[PDB]
UniProtKB/Swiss-Prot annotation, chains A, B:
Family per record: Belongs to the group II decarboxylase family. Sphingosine-1-phosphate lyase subfamily.
Domain of life where this protein originates: Eukaryota
Positions bearing N6-(pyridoxal phosphate)lysine: 250
Mutagenesis or variant effect for residue 250 to A: Loss of enzyme activity
Regions of this protein lying in the Cytoplasmic compartment: 1-426
Gene that this polypeptide is encoded by: DPL1
Organism of derivation: Saccharomyces cerevisiae (strain ATCC 204508 / S288c) (Baker's yeast)
Protein name in the entry: Sphingosine-1-phosphate lyase
GO molecular function: identical protein binding; pyridoxal phosphate binding; sphinganine-1-phosphate aldolase activity
Organism placement in taxonomy: Eukaryota, Fungi, Dikarya, Ascomycota, Saccharomycotina
Full protein: residues contained: 131 to 579 of 589
Enzyme class: lyase
Keyword Endoplasmic reticulum found: yes
Amino acid sequence: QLMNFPQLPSNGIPQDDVIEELNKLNDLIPHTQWKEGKVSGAVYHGGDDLIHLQTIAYEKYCVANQLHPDVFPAVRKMESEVVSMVLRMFNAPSDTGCGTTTSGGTESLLLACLSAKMYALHHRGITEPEIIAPVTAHAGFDKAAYYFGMKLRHVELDPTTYQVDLGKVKKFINKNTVLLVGSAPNFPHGIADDIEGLGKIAQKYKLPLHVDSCLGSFIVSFMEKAGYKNLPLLDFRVPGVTSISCDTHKYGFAPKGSSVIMYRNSDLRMHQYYVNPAWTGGLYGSPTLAGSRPGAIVVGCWATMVNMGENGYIESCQEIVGAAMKFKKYIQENIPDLDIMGNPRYSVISFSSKTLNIHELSDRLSKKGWHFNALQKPVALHMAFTRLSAHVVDEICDILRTTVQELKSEGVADKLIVGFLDALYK
Amino acid sequence: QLMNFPQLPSNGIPQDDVIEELNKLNDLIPHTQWKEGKVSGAVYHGGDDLIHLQTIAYEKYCVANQLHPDVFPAVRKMESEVVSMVLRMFNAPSDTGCGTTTSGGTESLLLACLSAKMYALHHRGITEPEIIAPVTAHAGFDKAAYYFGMKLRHVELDPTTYQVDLGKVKKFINKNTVLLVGSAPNFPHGIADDIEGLGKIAQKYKLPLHVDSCLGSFIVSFMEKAGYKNLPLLDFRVPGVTSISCDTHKYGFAPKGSSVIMYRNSDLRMHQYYVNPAWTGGLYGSPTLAGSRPGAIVVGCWATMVNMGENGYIESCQEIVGAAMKFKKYIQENIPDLDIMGNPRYSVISFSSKTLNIHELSDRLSKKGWHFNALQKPVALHMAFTRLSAHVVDEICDILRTTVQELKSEGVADKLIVGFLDALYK
């Protein structure tokens, strides 16, 4: 049995008695087997070898804190490089094309939102900021409206392609609209909204255009280098594109808790910064929303991108997307009871069904240890393909079986969410 | 010479060619010698042995993501423990006394602010939130007002004790006031504001009381167990105390990027959470402000607190504070040209001088490789004692020498800060 600690021990336990417990924890208390590619997301690589790299890199820069460039210059140099490499993947202006680093993919979105808020509030003085984005967007956009007190307006989609209706959005352009969003790809259905034709509308109403490539990251960019044709534009080559998010801790396989927000020029990110010279403790200047920052993490991110190179994320994209498509084809050819959502061109595959109760089906799967992300409006579920789940041949026959087992069988919910949040500390 | 990367390499370089570069970086590009205890802050421990622990712990839980408790349960169990141990250090109600974990010490402050904003906006419906705090507070409080659009009102201090004037604050109690802050200790001067007598005023105007112990962390709490007398109350034993911040990545020696925010009951933190069931991608529920979170970091934090135990942070407090006091005494007995700021009872020591130009003095030191935090209003400087700088006997004779070398010698600055922020990516 493993020992728990309601409070600090009388005497500190040796390092040896610790790692033993660090293993007792992994070995004992059961969990979802991500190592066996049974989770849609969470772990995106899992390679014992890769982990070891970012582990020793962690050790080298364990104390690193981006708050102090004068003390940790190498970390500064490695960030300027990371952002630089990511900028080239999305073909940002080699001239004014700047960028910045963030923690989670969520912080990246909030910084693009704060950028537009304090921008339109500087060139238009909008006292009532208003952000508009697809319903298929990410909760990261729904947070910004809550925190910054902005007005978030959801826009419905095209029932056929499941993309975004570029017409309904026009009906929402106001004197308060500060930015328009285009998830590419979105989290729910993994389908890139019309971006190539969205960099034209942005130019019309002089509004900032943000692309939520947090999920796409190192897949969408390499779709072209992987040898895939008929692919829209999802980046700065689209003149109407302002900012672009990208999670390196996702499909970059970088240490969890590392993403990047990009811009077309510096005067934009200027509005995402915080400046307070008046402060007595000195004169703060957070490039992001955080004070002290985990230097090691970004270093581990820098090391993976080099160890992988441009050739790595190709053999990565080809593999991941390769499986996602094989998956899609199998649930079309076989498993006739399922319905693909739109035309997933990438590594994320979504689907639904009116013949079966998808809600119960999900439970039938989770009971077998396989966890698909449960969706709503419409009620569905998907599988974000990772290197681990890239061993798909198994869970294709698995889902068919489960579907075979299905057909062979004759109020304010706001208060509930808070409950399982408090339950994370007992 | 070290190789730089404007973009991803043609072919990924072997792990071996990476760690070599990871060392070339440390070895080559010069930096401030924190290992020699020449930095007031940044690195708080630096122990090769300790680092190794949190390094292998990192490896065990490298993929860990707090977004998925069902996948990483051990991380859940270790967080519930961490918060639990920290709660006991500050003597929170063993009944309703709850808590939560955060990234940087900054996020912890913002969550206490959002807590009060969405609280007074729920029980009083205050459309114009108003936060009041000492000028000696932290920039973390100045950020919340900027992001959440709250009104931050600074309050001056007592010219003699350098604490906070509990009278001037009374003159600011409004129908918009949502919380009062009490830095303990503050960053600028490392002097704990009157908290023992501040838990009485909080009860008067039924306002939430937040203690910024982000800097004090594992020092203030252990001041009593270290064998020190005549110590005010800086925690929940003060009935008027609502929330309390604490940076574990500071004096806890935990992996950088880990702090904790505490409450007296759950209904408080309830307001710091984010809830969005309406979201189509599912039903988000961020306990903090972040999406995906670095599980490894909190695990490394959990491992240090156990390896240290309650006996570790005593031999820690006794050592750190021991040096800070020896430092203070030496600049009083010797170095008659300096003036201690108030009565620093802890590990942080601040001072000033009218005889010498402190600004130039700071430069004289930084030129010798010794970096003290430059302060303003009043123009001064301090030294936050870490385990490394806890070898003080040296830099006491160093500062005297530098002072000896001193006396032996016959517009909108807002636009400037943004400059050195953009310069972090070239």
